[PDB]
């Protein structure tokens, strides 16, 4: 059948919807290669799952991602989290349980929220000070 399963990633408002479709190679993000994406000092980070798992889980898929939201940093964690999760879901659904179970164990060993979403988001400013917890100076006499 038409093999397509979709996932998303999060990190503090930054969605990255990564569809995993059958194929081979040719992983992209935003219609660009992920061999350069432009801070490229955190370049080793989005490459990390691919490098660690080897090329033999990526031996039959094209994964492509669209993004929006967040800053430069938070986008990198979102796209990484999505492609990792994409791979897992694909094997659970069209291959078998024991296929994805190995791969799940590998990622969660060096967990860096590779299968879960960071809960933390910004807290509101309340008056009487800048920020969400700081207070203006208070002078006596």
């Amino acid at each position: 059948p038409l093999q397509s399963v979709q996932v998303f990633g999060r990190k503090k408002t930054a969605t990255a919807v990564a569809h995993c479709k059958r194929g081979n190679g040719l992983i992209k993000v935003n219609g660009r290669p992920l061999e350069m994406i432009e801070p490229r000092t955190l370049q080793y980070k989005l490459l990390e799952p691919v490098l660690l798992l080897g090329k033999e889980r990526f031996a039959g898929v094209d994964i492509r991602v669209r993004v929006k939201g967040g800053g430069h940093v938070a986008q990198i964690y979102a796209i990484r989290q999505s492609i990792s999760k994409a791979l897992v879901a694909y094997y659970q659904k069209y291959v078998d349980e024991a296929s994805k179970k190995e791969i799940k164990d590998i990622l969660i060993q060096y967990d860096r929220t590779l299968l879960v979403a960071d809960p933390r988001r910004c807290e509101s400013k309340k008056f009487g000070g800048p920020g969400a917890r700081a207070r203006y100076q208070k002078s006596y006499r």
Binding site: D96, E97, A98
Partner: protein, 313 residues
């Protein structure tokens, strides 16, 4: 005499195994439901590396999956879940054929007929209901019904007999007749509320149970109280056997397998000790089901395991 050896144990769930049922088309598979919102279709081996591995896990329900049952074809599967809805699976990869919308509250029990066109359901809506296999309501039963939740319903052999069993928490067993939908009878005889009921494959018996403490037997052919046995403090599952005339009773710390010809206990299954304080050594057994061979039976427990046993002669 015949006795039981501990065969092995399966692992795959993160929650309590609620029910198990068995494909007679393939004794190679076996199916399970659980309180971590998945039904696991297994791939069994008789090996020592494992006794089986989960093949797939069908997902969609937003709450626990209480009970599960096979189709006559064995290529479909049907479910009852604590989300108040049912799903009708196409037992291959997933891909729901139909989802059945009705019932205000949970779907506790569910069953699939021999004719494959009638599907019943027990619900905390206080309704027995009949279901087309197009997923629409052939009939709904809400008059002359239980005033308490309907615990478990069953299809009975339709050799010439149009009867379906119903038991509720109102301390009654109601028998309903197909396409008239009247009370055939009401049976009284359970101090506690009734959990379950099941009919013999031959079709002459109804092994019923509850929190009565006693396991009372009723007659499928006109409704008579055949006899009673002291045992089964809390009764959660019952299952007749095809290769013997036994009845296998699910109590919490133990399973009591009874020969009825004459009435005697064959064995009591006990699990090996584990040192606990104050006391949490038993896990509750909640379900059990025979294989087609009738040599091996499987059990669902609340320690997230499906324990296997085997009869030895």
């Amino acid at each position: 005499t015949e006795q039981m050896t501990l065969r092995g144990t399966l692992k795959g769930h993160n929650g309590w195994v609620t029910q198990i049922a068995t494909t007679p088309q393939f004794p190679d598979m076996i199916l399970s439901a659980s309180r971590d919102k998945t039904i696991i279709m297994w791939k069994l081996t008789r090996d020592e590396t494992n006794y089986g591995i989960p093949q797939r896990a069908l997902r969609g329900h937003s709450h626990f999956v209480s009970d599960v049952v096979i189709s006559s074809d064995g290529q479909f599967a049907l479910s009852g879940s604590w989300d108040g809805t049912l799903r009708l699976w196409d037992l291959t990869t997933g891909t729901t054929t139909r989802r059945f919308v009705g019932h205000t509250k949970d779907v506790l029990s569910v069953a699939f007929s021999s004719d494959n066109r009638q599907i019943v359901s027990g619900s905390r809506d206080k309704t027995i209901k009949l279901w087309n296999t197009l997923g629409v309501c052939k009939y709904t039963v809400q008059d002359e019904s239980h005033s308490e939740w309907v615990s478990c319903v069953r299809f009975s052999p339709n050799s010439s007999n149009p009867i379906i069993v119903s038991c509720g928490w109102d301390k009654l067993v109601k028998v309903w007749n197909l396409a008239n939908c009247k009370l055939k009878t009401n049976h009284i005889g359970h101090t506690g509320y009734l959990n379950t009921v099941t009919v013999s494959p031959d079709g002459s018996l109804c092994a019923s149970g509850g929190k009565d403490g006693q396991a009372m037997l009723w007659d499928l052919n006109e409704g008579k109280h055949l006899y009673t046995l002291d045992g089964g403090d809390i009764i959660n599952a019952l299952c007749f056997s095809p290769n013997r005339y036994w009845l296998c009773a699910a109590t919490g710390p133990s399973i009591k397998i009874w020969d009825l010809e004459g009435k005697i206990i064959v064995d009591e299954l006990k699990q090996e000790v584990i040192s606990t304080s104050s006391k949490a050594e038993p896990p509750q057994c909640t379900s059990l089901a025979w294989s087609a061979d009738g040599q091996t039976l499987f059990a669902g427990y609340t320690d997230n395991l499906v324990r296997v046993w085997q009869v030895t002669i």
